[PDB]
Design a protein around this ligand. Structure first.
Ligand code: GNP
Ligand code: MG
Lengths: 161, 314
């Protein structure tokens, strides 16, 4: 039984992603105060995803969830270049976290359905991800809106449980 | 091909005419003393480091994000509304979800009040229901004891004073009105303070003339001195019709499958009685649910929001 942590900046699309995995309505998703839990079957695994509020003010609560995390899924708004640096910094601090040591991380380059959307190529080395050697990692272009590319990320997650 | 941004403009009036964005992301940044009018539907809009601007955003499928903005006046509709590091924003809002502020002060909210001929279709293209508007419903992530980082605009606020109609060539080709009675989004009080503690629930069922009926009813109730608190648009299943309508559910069961219902919350002393009278005169042959009395109306409204909160919840 697999423990998934869903993090990333406010507005990146964490909850929209969570509800797509559970295959549910996505048009009434409100910003998250607190957090959301959902079980999802994929590939033969029972996945418990923790969808945590991601705005600046509540990020200090992230820590209280690191415990027993099997997989970190980290979501980025690909179509918000202005915050690339801010998410750049949150990700780098997560991977420094002792309680998350060795934990496989999947990065979702989300919102590729969009125009300004920077490709997985540019974001990856924009955050110099290739200098992660603490753990296994992957970048998946996706759109939590249409659900496209999501399954491909989840397949990698299962591969690495 | 980013002619989908306004970047670093000063002292200008610019905008977008219908069909010119067609559901793409739009980006505003580094604009001072500008008047910006986006008369088309958007995927999402971020507004960064803007000072003393006037902004209109046509329907937004996703979120509208204000960051580091000061003295802006806006009318916008969107799926999510987010504000960070902003001062003195005045907003006429239509929002699917809870509006959110963080690290901000003096943010003022009013109900979206705008019309043009292309707008209704834009809402549709944005996937935004004109009846699902929680504009007064702010959550503040950084409250500050003893004061309030946000408030409501006065009801007597006239839209022209905050978001003037455009007078430039480009922009008056789009036929705009800021009158309450022509607004695409019906004007709701939300959480404005009320004098009366009498509410009334009306549920109309899917059909070609329902939207028109909601408006005509709204107008009849406002004409008689009552107030529209809230609207809701949601699928009613049989179970849900039983919770709300109770032993009047049988009568409405046939109708639930044509599509979403439209709920209206009315407010005022005599609201139920007067609502009954109007429905009886003006909608013969059209089946609607109207609360039976003052005594049951409150119950009615709660049960409706209950079931609908869960359908729209997580
Ligand atoms: N076009 C588009 N919009 C998306 C996509 N993913 C999410 N959105 C939109 O982006 C906004 C934020 O989504 P949300 O799921 O609330 O993000 P979040 O990461 O949970 N935010 P928070 O940390 O505040 O809870 C919403 O308007 C949502 O509809 C995507 O792939 N494409
Ligand atoms: Mg969320």
């Amino acid at each position: 039984e697999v423990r998934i942590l869903l993090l990333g900046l406010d507005n990146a699309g964490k909850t929209t992603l969570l509800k797509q995995l559970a295959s549910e309505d996505i048009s009434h998703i409100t910003p998250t105060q607190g957090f959301n839990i959902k079980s999802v079957q994929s590939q033969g695994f029972k996945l418990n995803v923790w969808d945590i509020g991601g705005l600046r003010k509540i990020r200090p609560y992230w820590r209280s969830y690191f415990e027993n995390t099997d997989i970190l899924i980290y979501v980025i708004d690909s179509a918000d270049r202005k915050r690339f640096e801010e998410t750049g910094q949150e990700l780098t601090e997560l991977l420094e976290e002792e309680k998350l040591s060795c934990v496989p991380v999947l990065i979702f380059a989300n919102k590729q359905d969009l125009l300004t959307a920077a490709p997985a190529s540019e974001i990856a080395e924009g955050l110099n991800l290739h200098t992660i050697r603490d753990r296994v990692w992957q970048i998946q272009s996706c759109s939590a809106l249409t659900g496209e590319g999501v399954q491909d990320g989840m397949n990698w997650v299962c591969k690495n449980v | 091909p980013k002619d989908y941004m306004f970047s670093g403009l000063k002292d200008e009036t610019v905008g977008r005419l219908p069909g010119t964005v067609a559901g793409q992301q739009f980006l505003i940044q580094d604009c001072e003393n500008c008047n910006i009018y986006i008369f088309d539907h958007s995927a999402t809009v971020t507004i960064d480091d803007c000072t003393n601007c006037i902004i209109f955003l046509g329907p937004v499928k996703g979120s509208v994000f204000f960051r580091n903005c000061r003295d802006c006046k806006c009318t916008l509709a969107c799926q999510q509304f987010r504000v960070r590091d902003c001062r003195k924003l005045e907003v006429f809002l239509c929002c699917a979800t809870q509006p959110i502020i963080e690290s901000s002060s003096n943010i003022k909210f009013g109900c979206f009040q705008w019309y043009y001929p292309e707008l209704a279709f834009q809402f549709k293209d944005a996937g935004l229901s004109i009846f699902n508007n929680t504009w007064s419903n702010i959550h503040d992530f950084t409250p500050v004891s003893g004061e309030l980082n946000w408030s409501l605009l006065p009801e007597d606020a006239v839209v022209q004073d905050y978001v003037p109609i455009p007078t430039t060539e480009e922009l008056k080709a789009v036929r705009v009105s800021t009158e309450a009675n022509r607004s695409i989004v019906p004007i709701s009080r939300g959480q404005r303070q009320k004098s009366s503690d009498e509410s009334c629930l009306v549920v109309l069922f899917a059909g070609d003339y329902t939207i028109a009926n909601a408006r005509k009813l709204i107008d009849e109730m406002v004409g008689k001195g009552f107030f529209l608190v809230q609207t809701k648009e949601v699928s009613m299943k049989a179970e849900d019709a039983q919770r709300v309508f109770r032993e009047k559910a049988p009568d409405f069961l046939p109708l639930l499958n044509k599509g979403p219902v439209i709920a209206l919350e009315f407010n005022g002393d005599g609201a139920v009685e007067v609502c009954q009278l109007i429905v009886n005169e003006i909608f013969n042959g059209t089946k609607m649910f109207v609360s039976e009395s003052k005594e049951t109306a409150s119950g009615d409204v709660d049960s409706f929001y209950n079931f609908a909160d869960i359908q729209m919840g997580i």
